[PDB]
Design a protein around this ligand. Structure first.
Ligand SMILES: OC[C@H]1O[C@H](O[C@H]2[C@H](O)[C@@H](O)[C@@H](O)O[C@@H]2CO)[C@H](O)[C@@H](O)[C@@H]1O
Ligand SMILES: [Zn+2]
Ligand SMILES: [Zn+2]
Ligand SMILES: [Zn+2]
Lengths: 383, 143, 199
């Protein structure tokens, strides 16, 4: 077999705190003699299905729960079977995030949602509204600061604005998603995205701002506002840029509605170390001890483990996180989510540049994201 | 007739049985263009393992031209990526013979023989948002 | 006066339907299904995969029943039976009564019914949802006589009727397929499919 027996190889995203995870691995090694290697490869969410398909890859893959339906569907993931006693230690709704066609296909780790993070020193009073940002920008665009910088290359970051006034991915009803009912080219969708483009046609954010550019900018005090997740808080602490975490700005009347991710740990179907990986995840990572260790590197957000969550919930930033979360929506985990995300990332990039109108950018993504009813009936499958 | 969605035939041979007609004799309209199906198209519909579609309780089917036309449209919009057969076998840990692969052009489920040809000729399979597609023998060189 | 079981398609509340592998028509194949014919060709005692597809999950306690009936109307009332020869050849797996034509292999939750009113045989297993990485549930059936078995099916074609039912035996779903149990399923499927295009 391609995956080596008697070790654990874990893949987790670079923004997440692999050192703290690596530390939980150390404690595992020193107890069990089992070597644990933590890696953070680029384009993890893409690299994994590519190598796992060949029967290779990590024993354990971390990602938000939204990719996992596709992985499970492609046969890349083993069924997760926790004992009732363990299952009961985690919030039921986090288990729900990693249930797919009646089966658990990952361990939920922590609930993630974007918050508005602001420098009090530059803005003791953050705009609680999106519309008062072009005005507040040029106030600093001769100061000479930008008002707002956040990643513009990943639709995850722009999705709150585009969804605030009525955009949505797949319609949820009765416990099921209707893959034919997509809400990407509706009024509120085009609305939030035209607004976003009228921040770049108007020189108030640059079309090509990415995660790197935005994090530095905010952490070197050159912008007073940014949108980012709980993992970002560690590098802000070391920059000492005196910051607060708060409710995202409203667009028109509406709360800005981020897609909510549950960071999740899946077990590679081709791993000969499935029982090992369970041991490691249930008895080392998903413990007050384990999560704290990872959390101290990069904050996880609101952890699935009840006991530790109750400690973390006292934290005002976690309360902010969950306030944004309850205003947002849990991502679906269905296999069509990756196409949805590719279609929306394309539409947002092509409208911030100019190869398409907002209206035609979203017209195309809606088309590529929804299904054709009649051909699907002819084929006899909803795929 | 057939306006109970929880109780009408899915497949042509069962539709023929419930009409007490035969497949040689049944008359069917394409669901897209509404034209009547040619006899060879009726046969093709069965061999291609397609499903009877119902509009307003009436049973339709599909003609060759429309099938190919609306398939290509669906494929364009939902093409994900491509793989050689060898990776597919690793991925699902089964012989290709066990995976559902339809012809990208005519939608006929590929035979093991057609799947093998893909392997022998190093022809990739295409993933259409979860659907696996290849090319059958009759669509393998052009008509 | 005794009834013949319906073969009528019934998707029901959970959108029940059958599925099959595409196993081709090579002379070596032991089980192959023709969608054009809606017909399974298989060898005696070999594995015949039958896939169960639902649109929504049926409650646990749901059961899946298989039953053979003769396809030809003048034979429909005769109970499908193994021939005396095979019925008395000690070829039991330990679960199936030796007179049952249709067996389920690899499932200890299998039950065999001799219906006290109709005398028809059926084999039943609990419904289980698809495993991870599967979109359907597969039951492995075995047919324990040749279609030609004299004293048994006597070259008469049969239908296998699959029914989804609740714990009490109420009908949740039904589908069926013709079965021919023979020595060369590959060749027989090829033959009948060719004659289908000529008629
Ligand atoms: O931008 C699309 C992308 O969004 C989400 O990815 C998040 C991830 O959930 C976070 O934990 C963090 O790593 O930032 C990512 C965005 O760069 C989805 O989870 C992912 O599938 C999707 O492609
Ligand atoms: Zn047509
Ligand atoms: Zn073809
Ligand atoms: Zn016999």
């Amino acid at each position: 077999m391609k995956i080596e027996e008697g070790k654990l190889v874990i893949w987790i995203n670079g923004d997440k705190g692999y050192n703290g995870l690596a530390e939980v691995g150390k404690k595992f090694e020193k107890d069990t003699g089992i070597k644990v290697t933590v890696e953070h490869p680029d384009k993890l969410e893409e690299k994994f299905p590519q190598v796992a398909a060949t029967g290779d890859g990590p024993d354990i893959i971390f990602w938000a729960h939204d990719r996992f339906g596709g992985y499970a569907q492609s046969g890349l993931l083993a069924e997760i079977t926790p004992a009732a006693a363990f299952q009961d230690k985690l919030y039921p709704f986090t288990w729900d995030a990693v249930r797919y066609n009646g089966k658990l296909i990952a361990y939920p780790i922590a609930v993630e949602a974007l918050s508005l993070i602001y420098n009090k020193d530059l803005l003791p009073n953050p705009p609680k509204t999106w519309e008062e940002i072009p005005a507040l920008d040029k106030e600093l665009k001769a100061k000479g600061k930008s008002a707002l910088m956040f990643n513009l290359q990943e639709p995850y970051f722009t999705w709150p604005l585009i969804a605030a006034d009525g955009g949505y991915a797949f319609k949820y009803e009765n416990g099921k998603y209707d893959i034919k009912d997509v809400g990407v080219d509706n009024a509120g969708a085009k609305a939030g995205l035209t607004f976003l483009v009228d921040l770049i046609k108007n020189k108030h954010m640059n079309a090509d701002t990415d995660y790197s550019i935005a994090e530095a900018a905010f952490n070197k005090g050159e912008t007073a506002m940014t949108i980012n997740g709980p993992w970002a808080w560690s590098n802000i602490d070391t920059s000492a840029v005196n910051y607060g975490v708060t409710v995202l700005p409203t667009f028109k009347g509406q709360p800005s509605k981020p897609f909510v991710g549950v960071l999740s740990a899946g077990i590679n179907a081709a791993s000969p170390n499935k029982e090992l990986a369970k041991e490691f995840l249930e008895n080392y990572l998903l413990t007050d001890e384990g999560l704290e260790a990872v959390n101290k590197d990069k904050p996880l957000g609101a952890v699935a483990l009840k006991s530790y969550e109750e400690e973390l919930a006292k934290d005002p930033r976690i309360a902010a996180t969950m306030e944004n979360a309850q205003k947002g929506e849990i991502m679906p985990n269905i296999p069509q989510m990756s196409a949805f995300w590719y279609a929306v990332r394309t539409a947002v990039i092509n409208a911030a540049s100019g190869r398409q109108t907002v209206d035609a950018a979203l017209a195309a993504a809606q088309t590529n994201a929804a299904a054709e009813l009649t051909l699907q009936e002819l084929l006899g499958e909803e795929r | 007739m057939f306006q109970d969605p929880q109780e009408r035939p899915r497949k042509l041979p069962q539709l023929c049985t419930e009409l007490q007609t035969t497949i040689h004799d049944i008359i069917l309209e394409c669901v897209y263009c509404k034209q009547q199906l040619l006899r060879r198209e009726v046969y093709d519909f069965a061999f291609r393992d397609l499903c009877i579609v119902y509009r307003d309780g009436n049973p339709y089917a599909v003609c060759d031209k429309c099938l190919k036309f609306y398939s290509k449209i669906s494929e364009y919009r939902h093409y994900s990526y491509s793989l050689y057969g060898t990776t597919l076998e690793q991925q699902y840990n089964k012989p290709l013979s066990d995976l559902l692969i339809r012809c990208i052009n005519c939608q006929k489920p590929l035979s093991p023989e057609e799947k093998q040809r893909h392997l022998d000729k190093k022809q990739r399979f295409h993933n259409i948002r979860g659907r696996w597609t290849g090319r059958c023998m009759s669509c393998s060189r052009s008509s | 006066s005794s009834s013949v079981p319906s073969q009528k398609t019934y998707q029901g509340s959970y959108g029940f339907r059958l599925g099959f592998l595409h196993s081709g028509t090579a002379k070596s194949v032991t089980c192959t299904y023709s969608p054009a014919l809606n017909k399974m060709f298989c060898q005696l005692a070999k594995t015949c995969p039958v896939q169960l597809w639902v649109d929504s999950t049926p409650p646990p306690g749901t059961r899946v029943r298989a039953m053979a009936i003769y396809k030809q109307s003048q034979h429909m009332t005769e109970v499908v039976r193994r021939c005396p020869h095979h019925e008395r050849c000690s070829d039991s797996d330990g679960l199936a009564p030796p007179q049952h034509l249709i067996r389920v292999e690899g499932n200890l939750r299998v039950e065999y019914l001799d219906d006290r009113n109709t005398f028809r045989h059926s084999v039943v297993v609990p419904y289980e949802p698809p495993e991870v990485g599967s979109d359907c549930t597969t039951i492995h059936y075995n047919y324990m006589c040749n279609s030609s078995c004299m004293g048994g099916m006597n070259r008469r074609p049969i239908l296998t009727i699959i029914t989804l039912e609740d714990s009490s035996g109420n009908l949740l779903g039904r589908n069926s397929f013709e079965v021919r149990v023979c020595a060369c399923p590959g060749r027989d499927r090829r033959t009948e499919e060719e004659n289908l295009r000529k008629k």
